[PDB]
Design a binder for this molecule. Sequence first.
Ligand SMILES: CN(C)CCCN1c2ccccc2CCc2ccccc21
Ligand SMILES: CN(C)CCCN1c2ccccc2CCc2ccccc21
Ligand SMILES: CCCCCCCCO[C@@H]1O[C@H](CO)[C@@H](O)[C@H](O)[C@H]1O
Ligand SMILES: CCCCCCCCO[C@@H]1O[C@H](CO)[C@@H](O)[C@H](O)[C@H]1O
Ligand SMILES: CCCCCCCCO[C@@H]1O[C@H](CO)[C@@H](O)[C@H](O)[C@H]1O
Ligand SMILES: CCCCCCCCO[C@@H]1O[C@H](CO)[C@@H](O)[C@H](O)[C@H]1O
Ligand SMILES: CCCCCCCCO[C@@H]1O[C@H](CO)[C@@H](O)[C@H](O)[C@H]1O
Ligand SMILES: CC(C)C[C@H](N)C(=O)O
Ligand code: NA
Ligand code: NA
Length: 511
Amino acid sequence: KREHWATRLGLILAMAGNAVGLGNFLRFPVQAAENGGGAFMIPYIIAFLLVGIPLMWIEWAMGRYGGAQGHGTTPAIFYLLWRNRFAKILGVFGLWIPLVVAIYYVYIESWTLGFAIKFLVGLVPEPPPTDPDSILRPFKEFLYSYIGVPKGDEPILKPSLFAYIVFLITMFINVSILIRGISKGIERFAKIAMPTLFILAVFLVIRVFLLETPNGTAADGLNFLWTPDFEKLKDPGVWIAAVGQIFFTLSLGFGAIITYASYVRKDQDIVLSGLTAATLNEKAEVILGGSISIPAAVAFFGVANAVAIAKAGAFNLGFITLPAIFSQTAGGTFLGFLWFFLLFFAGLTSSIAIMQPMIAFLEDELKLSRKHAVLWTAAIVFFSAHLVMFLNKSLDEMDFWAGTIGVVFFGLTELIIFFWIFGADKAWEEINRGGIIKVPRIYYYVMRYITPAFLAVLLVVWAREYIPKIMEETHWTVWITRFYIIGLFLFLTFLVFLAERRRNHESAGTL
Ligand SMILES: CN(C)CCCN1c2ccccc2CCc2ccccc21
Ligand SMILES: CN(C)CCCN1c2ccccc2CCc2ccccc21
Ligand SMILES: CCCCCCCCO[C@@H]1O[C@H](CO)[C@@H](O)[C@H](O)[C@H]1O
Ligand SMILES: CCCCCCCCO[C@@H]1O[C@H](CO)[C@@H](O)[C@H](O)[C@H]1O
Ligand SMILES: CCCCCCCCO[C@@H]1O[C@H](CO)[C@@H](O)[C@H](O)[C@H]1O
Ligand SMILES: CCCCCCCCO[C@@H]1O[C@H](CO)[C@@H](O)[C@H](O)[C@H]1O
Ligand SMILES: CCCCCCCCO[C@@H]1O[C@H](CO)[C@@H](O)[C@H](O)[C@H]1O
Ligand SMILES: CC(C)C[C@H](N)C(=O)O
Ligand code: NA
Ligand code: NA
């Protein structure tokens, strides 16, 4: 019938690995530092309670429900919940979003492997022996030469040969896990990766906590991040950033939680399991991810400079600043290795999660073998990634449409289909069925009224005071990426159409 997670621990760690990734260690620090630190945290915590938790339960429920009938992806699941052809089309986003995100996420993940390798072997810049630019410049040049940032006017990137080869290796590693399946692949790997990730992260926090310079200490960083600023609570931008981060960090709206949950046995609890996966992610994000790069940057440069660093380049903090700071300490190159190794495992456990939806669709709906499903998915991602590797800003365009606005739109869509169309009481029943614990009574009202209203308002503000600038103030090359990803949606819709026909073909054979 269908693969199933072998153990409860395996399920929890696989789901935790799905969630805990580059978003916790790279994205969170930038969003927080960029939005006033503590001022960002209030909306963040509220978004977690009003959006993160409820949507997590909903996605687990939708996945388990679909899995019981042999379906793990939204084109089919949405249809099961709402037998309307439009359900299948909306469901395509559950394949498109994770695919598009994988197309750039796996490449960023590959940079962490490449950096881990170079730092391990000591092929790193030799900063000069205390002028900040003289210290940071060598590391900025290191990153820029790796990914091939434009030195001229052309919006073209020229990745180093090493970077390209490392992306290939990274794709191979993802495949090596996925090709073994759910219990012998993803689950087995999670039991090894998560413990390693936790240990590495705790160690790094401890080392960072020992940092002190004439400019400050790690403590100043924590105070910056954990001191409330009730005067920003009225800024939509902060709310948009906070909600966006919650979706991204919890893997919500990517169809990934849903697919993983489709392997949970029909009787199995999802209330406690889902809540645990969610809380584990938040601890890894605010306690671990929040305690590494920000405190380190603030300790060495002070708050004002740390904040300016993050705003200047989203990848500055994790790929340039932290390694530069580490280089000023004994054994700093090895500490850099540990940081990038941590990022790699965090990324790896998440990228396999966003490639599994396409794999599940090809297996469940087009009946391909796991081997063929995994290889074709890898081929599509590998090929498509060339756009992200060679066209400047393609990555940002994909991250916006699929990884930012896309997931919020899809989150609202799945909630409406499950809690409104399918039926609020049928949905509530499905969520709580088999639960080790019941979902708190108040959450019924949050899921049915609060969450959808919250997201609806957010999306309207996004499309009215932000999306116009992205459509009018960007370089013309953004249309190359938009064109390509719209094509991917077209192709995936064609596959759903073919799945429909095979099912009809197959039914007229069941007759
Ligand atoms: C703004 N351009 C340069 C980066 C956008 C993508 N990006 C983002 C997005 C917002 C804030 C920070 C970061 C950096 C880390 C990260 C990690 C994984 C996937 C995407 C991201
Ligand atoms: C100690 N041994 C069992 C772990 C190393 C193997 N391991 C790993 C670990 C890191 C990178 C790649 C891979 C290969 C594929 C893979 C698949 C399932 C379980 C573990 C792994
Ligand atoms: C199958 C799809 C192929 C698309 C064309 C890919 C061309 C990649 O080309 C390779 O890029 C590397 C990184 O920039 C360079 O180091 C190599 O020398 C170059 O041959
Ligand atoms: C993980 C092992 C990766 C090995 C590939 C390293 C690519 C780094 O650099 C490349 O190495 C090639 C052969 O040494 C040279 O011919 C290229 O000119 C050089 O740029
Ligand atoms: C949209 C994605 C298009 C990918 C096409 C990539 C074509 C690669 O082009 C190659 O890149 C190498 C490294 O940058 C150069 O050294 C080669 O001279 C160049 O021909
Ligand atoms: C979005 C895709 C960006 C691809 C960047 C490709 C850079 C390739 O390199 C270019 O290839 C041309 C034709 O092969 C040559 O005529 C140019 O001299 C060469 O620089
Ligand atoms: C905005 C979302 C807030 C969620 C916090 C929920 C805290 C749980 O609250 C508890 O829920 C139980 C079950 O319904 C009740 O029996 C308890 O009386 C109630 O205090
Ligand atoms: C797209 C998701 C799998 C990303 C993951 N939740 C992270 O925080 O990195
Ligand atoms: Na996360
Ligand atoms: Na992960």
